[PDB]
Structure 1
Amino acid sequence: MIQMQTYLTIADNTGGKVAQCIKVLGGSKRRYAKIGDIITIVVKQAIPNSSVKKGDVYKAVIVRTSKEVRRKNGTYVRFDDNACVILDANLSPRGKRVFGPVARELRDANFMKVVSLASEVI
């Protein structure tokens, strides 16, 4: 349940460490993004001398949320912080590695390469 102004952990090795959601894409009054949705983020904090500067606007995909969402088989998975991964123009991960686990709705949202680069899929 990421909305506008939410802070997120960037979970990849581009350089950013904190991002802020500034828009939820795909819908007119759309207010919440869930796992596997694409948001527009601004970078609020980055590793020094990186390829990603603080104050740039990118698109990102949500990989962990702290609010559980129902699955078909009745199981709910609720992480412990909200985290996203930056994307380039092709809607593919800009980075080369992903830190920590991700949720398996990326599988269905067709982010197979994010899933593969993740460490654990829950």
Structure 2
Amino acid sequence: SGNGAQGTKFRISLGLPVGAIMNCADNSGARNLYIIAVKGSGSRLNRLPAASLGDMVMATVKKGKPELRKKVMPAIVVRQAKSWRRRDGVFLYFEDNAGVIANPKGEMKGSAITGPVGKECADLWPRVASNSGVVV
């Protein structure tokens, strides 16, 4: 996260390291996003900077419109597919790793979102909370 943050984030297990590919949720004309970096990552030798839900990342488009391909853009993660714990005690996970496109200060490039999201993201990125059909 970072500049567009509407607050803080309790930890959640990392599933999305770099070289990862996650489907795109919105109607921006993209299909998949290829992660390369994570805002807020640390620095340890030979550790891969990993992403989780709610995080903002830098990503490219390996499939979609050439209006978006071949450049790097900020993105947000909304589904993780790895079990993570909530402090109410329950572990949960979706079935797919999914994200959207954004500008550095939080606003989305698209207008809509397909499928559900995480409350841990909708509570941190409000513009996502508007264009969300579901929050869980």
TM-score (norm 1): 0.87
In the alignment, what sits opposite 2:51? 33
In the alignment, is the contact (CA less than 8 A) between 1:11 and 1:83 conserved in 2?
yes
Letter in structure 1 aligned against 2:81: S
Q: State the shift of 1:92 in Å.
A: 1.6
Q: State the shift of 1:56 in Å.
A: 1.8
- Aligned pair partner of 2:36 in 11, 22, 25: 22
CA distance in 2, matches of 1:90, 1:24: 15
3-state DSSP of counterpart to 1:106? helix
- Structure 1 gaps of 5+ residues are none
Q: State the shift of 1:91 in Å.
A: 2.0
3-state DSSP of counterpart to 2:58? strand
2:103 aligned with 1:88: yes
- Aligned pair partner of 2:62 in 40, 44, 51: 44
Cα RMSD over matched residues? 1.6
- Structure 2 gaps of 5+ residues are 1-14
Letter in structure 1 aligned against 2:74: K
Q: State the shift of 1:35 in Å.
A: 0.6
- Same amino acid, percent of matched pairs: 30
Number of residue pairs the alignment of both structures matches: 118
3-state DSSP of counterpart to 1:77? strand
TM-score (norm 2): 0.79
Letter in structure 1 aligned against 2:85: R
In the alignment, what sits opposite 1:62? 77
In the alignment, what sits opposite 2:10? none
